[PDB]
Amino acid sequence: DISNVLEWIIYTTGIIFVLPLFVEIPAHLQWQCGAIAVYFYWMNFLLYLQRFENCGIFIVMLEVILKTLLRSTVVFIF
Amino acid sequence: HAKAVALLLSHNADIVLNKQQASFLHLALHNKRKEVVLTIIRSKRWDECLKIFSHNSPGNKCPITEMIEYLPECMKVLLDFCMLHYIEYNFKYLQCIYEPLTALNAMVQNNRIELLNHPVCKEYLLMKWLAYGFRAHMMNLGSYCLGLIPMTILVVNIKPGMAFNSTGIILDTTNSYLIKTCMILVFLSSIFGYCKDISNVLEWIIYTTGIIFVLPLFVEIPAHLQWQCGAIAVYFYWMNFLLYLQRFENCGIFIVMLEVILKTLLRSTVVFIFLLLAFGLSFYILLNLQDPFSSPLLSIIQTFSMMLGDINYRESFLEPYLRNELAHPVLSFAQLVSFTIFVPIVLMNLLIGLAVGDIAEVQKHASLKRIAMQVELHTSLEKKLPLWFLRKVDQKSTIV
Amino acid sequence: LLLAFGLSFYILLNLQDPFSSPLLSIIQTFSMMLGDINYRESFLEPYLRNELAHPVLSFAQLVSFTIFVPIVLMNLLIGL
Amino acid sequence: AVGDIAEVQKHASLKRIAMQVELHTSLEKKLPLWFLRKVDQKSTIVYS
Ligand SMILES: Cc1noc(Cn2c(=O)c3c(ncn3[C@@H](C)C(=O)Nc3cccc(-c4cnc(C(F)(F)F)nc4)n3)n(C)c2=O)n1
Numbered sequence: 001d002i003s004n005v006l007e008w009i010i011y012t013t014g015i016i017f018v019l020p021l022f023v024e025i026p027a028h029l030q031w032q033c034g035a036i037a038v039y040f041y042w043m044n045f046l047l048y049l050q051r052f053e054n055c056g057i058f059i060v061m062l063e064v065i066l067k068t069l070l071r072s073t074v075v076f077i078f
Numbered sequence: 079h080a081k082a083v084a085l086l087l088s089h090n091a092d093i094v095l096n097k098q099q100a101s102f103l104h105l106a107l108h109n110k111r112k113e114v115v116l117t118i119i120r121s122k123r124w125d126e127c128l129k130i131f132s133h134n135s136p137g138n139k140c141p142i143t144e145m146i147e148y149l150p151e152c153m154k155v156l157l158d159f160c161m162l163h164y165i166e167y168n169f170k171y172l173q174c175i176y177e178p179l180t181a182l183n184a185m186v187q188n189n190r191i192e193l194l195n196h197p198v199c200k201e202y203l204l205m206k207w208l209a210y211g212f213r214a215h216m217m218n219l220g221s222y223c224l225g226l227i228p229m230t231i232l233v234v235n236i237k238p239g240m241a242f243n244s245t246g247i248i249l250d251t252t253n254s255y256l257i258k259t260c261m262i263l264v265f266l267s268s269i270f271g272y273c274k275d276i277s278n279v280l281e282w283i284i285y286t287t288g289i290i291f292v293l294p295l296f297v298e299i300p301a302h303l304q305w306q307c308g309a310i311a312v313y314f315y316w317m318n319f320l321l322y323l324q325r326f327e328n329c330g331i332f333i334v335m336l337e338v339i340l341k342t343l344l345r346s347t348v349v350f351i352f353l354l355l356a357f358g359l360s361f362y363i364l365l366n367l368q369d370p371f372s373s374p375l376l377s378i379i380q381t382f383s384m385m386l387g388d389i390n391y392r393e394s395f396l397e398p399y400l401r402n403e404l405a406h407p408v409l410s411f412a413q414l415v416s417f418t419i420f421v422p423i424v425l426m427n428l429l430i431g432l433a434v435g436d437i438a439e440v441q442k443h444a445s446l447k448r449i450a451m452q453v454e455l456h457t458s459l460e461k462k463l464p465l466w467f468l469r470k471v472d473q474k475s476t477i478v
Numbered sequence: 479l480l481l482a483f484g485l486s487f488y489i490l491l492n493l494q495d496p497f498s499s500p501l502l503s504i505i506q507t508f509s510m511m512l513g514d515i516n517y518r519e520s521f522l523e524p525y526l527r528n529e530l531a532h533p534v535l536s537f538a539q540l541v542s543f544t545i546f547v548p549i550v551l552m553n554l555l556i557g558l
Numbered sequence: 559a560v561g562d563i564a565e566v567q568k569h570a571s572l573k574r575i576a577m578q579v580e581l582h583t584s585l586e587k588k589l590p591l592w593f594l595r596k597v598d599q600k601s602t603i604v605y606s
């Protein structure tokens with residue numbers, strides 16, 4: 001499932017972002033993981049909004065449009 | 079049995095109501111008996127059958143309303159008799175506590191666009207327009223313009239950011255008479271507008287900001303506040319003027335479409351604001367060393383600005399990268415590609431498809447919506463006008 | 479609609495050449511109706527130089543313009 | 559995209575109600591029977 005992959009990435013990158021709570025890490029890696037974590041945190045939040053009356057259909061439409069585009073990029077990439 | 083009905087009518091049968099307060103015309107209409115209803119209409123006793131009904135019967139209403147609801151073809155046949163070719167249109171069957179424009183309101187409620195497009199109904203609506211509706215709307219529009227036009231004259235004649243009063247531009251007393259006249263007109267329209275829903279909020283903002291704009295007519299205020307309120311007032315003055323244009327034939331449907339598109343967009347911003355937030359915060363982290371992304375709020379505004387295609391690839395991604403000033407360059411380019419895929423393509427195409435569907439749905443019933451707008455305007459006007467004036471201006475027929 | 483935004487941009491962005499006159503401001507507003515809003519040259523760079531009188535008003539009007547004309551108005555024309 | 563949005567809008571209300579039905583059906587399959595019996599109402603009083 002895509003949602004499981006998204007959540008796994010979120011949790012791993014969030015752990016690495018706040019890792020200096022226990023073990024010191026370089027700032028470059030910390031903020032490189034923080035960018036990924038914040039981006040996927042707010043991207044995966046749209047999946048929680050799909051369980052509301054006013055937001056579910058818009059998320060369904062966004063998924064349909066994105067899947068149609070992705071099935072077509074493998075052609076126009078050439 | 080139309081022949082049976084004709085034979086019984088030719089023998090002077092009494093038209094009565096049964097224990098359910100229904101006449102034979104009511105029974106024919108509720109059974110959709112087109113032939114016998116046509117026989118009754120073309121009979122020499124049609125006027126007598128028209129008068130037989132009870133005003134307190136819920137099911138057996140006035141036969142004209144029942145005809146509109148059940149047999150609109152018979153209503154069309156009846157209306158064809160009301161236009162006698164110097165064509166004269168008779169509105170005897172078009173109006174009868176009852177709502178104003180009863181027949182036309184029934185036509186609108188029953189989606190009788192073929193009935194509403196009849197020349198008799200068109201002339202009825204035009205008669206009501208030229209009788210009171212055009213005058214009422216023009217008085218309202220002129221009252222609005224009495225503050226809309228002087229404010230625009232003030233804005234385009236005084237340099238923004240400069241304090242001014244009745245004397246002139248604080249001192250440049252050259253256009254002093256025009257400035258004072260426009261200030262007085264704006265003040266009077268704003269206080270009069272206080273003595274006359276989204277529209278009420280818009281008008282309240284307009285009047286308050288217009289008062290503050292021309293406040294130095296009485297009490298001195300700083301130029302910054304004056305022009306800060308003047309910008310708001312002129313913007314909302316010309317934005318709310320579109321609501322006055324909705325009461326015209328050529329402009330109403332476009333305003334309806336604009337409202338539908340705007341509402342559809344606003345119901346969707348509460349969802350894609352989080353997409354914009356994700357991309358803006360990620361760009362804030364990745365492109366922090368650049369002025370457009372130096373703050374979270376500036377980064378979010380920039381991400382909102384590049385949603386139409388102004389991504390600034392060379393200034394923000396290619397030139398910084400070739401200068402080795404891009405921290406996380408692979409991450410920055412990956413997020414650039416993902417943004418381009420998501421917002422300027424997927425999100426914009428989603429909005430475009432939603433708009434196409436909305437416009438198609440509006441255009442499906444454009445003529446019905448237009449005639450319904452006219453009918454609603456005149457019905458609401460009649461409910462507020464005095465009975466003596468309505469009797470004075472009400473025409474029973476129109477000769478063309 | 480263009481008159482509403484063009485005159486408001488005239489007051490807010492007066493100190494800039496594209497909005498120095500009421501007529502130039504309306505032509506500029508008509509020109510940014512396709513998406514050439516000039517956000518950096520007209521809103522971001524002047525603001526970071528503290529040359530934007532009414533900076534909160536300008537950014538609020540910039541967001542409202544983008545919502546209205548290049549999105550709602552253009553999609554209305556496309557759907558039509 | 560226009561075609562996709564039109565196809566989605568064709569069955570928008572059905573898709574919405576189906577989403578609600580699916581959410582509650584999946585929730586009930588995981589909740590304990592005692593809790594479901596505790597919270598289940600047999601009637602509700604309000605006020606081609
Ligand atoms: C389809 C579908 N799938 O699950 C459902 C669930 N679902 C409903 O949503 C729902 C409902 N009966 C009414 N309701 C709405 C009014 C209701 O509660 N709404 C509600 C509640 C809390 C928060 C929010 C809200 C909205 N928007 C945002 C956002 F920030 F994203 F903008 N945050 C929060 N909304 N049923 C039977 C249902 O299953 N519907």
Ligand SMILES: Cc1noc(Cn2c(=O)c3c(ncn3[C@@H](C)C(=O)Nc3cccc(-c4cnc(C(F)(F)F)nc4)n3)n(C)c2=O)n1
Nearest residue numbers: 203204207211323324325326327328329330448451452455
């Ligand atoms: C729907 C609906 N809702 O209310 C109505 C009202 N309405 C009509 O408008 C109408 C009509 N019978 C003909 N008419 C038109 C031709 C008529 O008078 N038009 C007219 C009159 C004065 C000014 C303008 C005009 C147009 N455009 C602009 C703008 F600057 F915005 F471009 N300024 C001014 N137009 N009826 C029965 C009616 O109800 N129609």
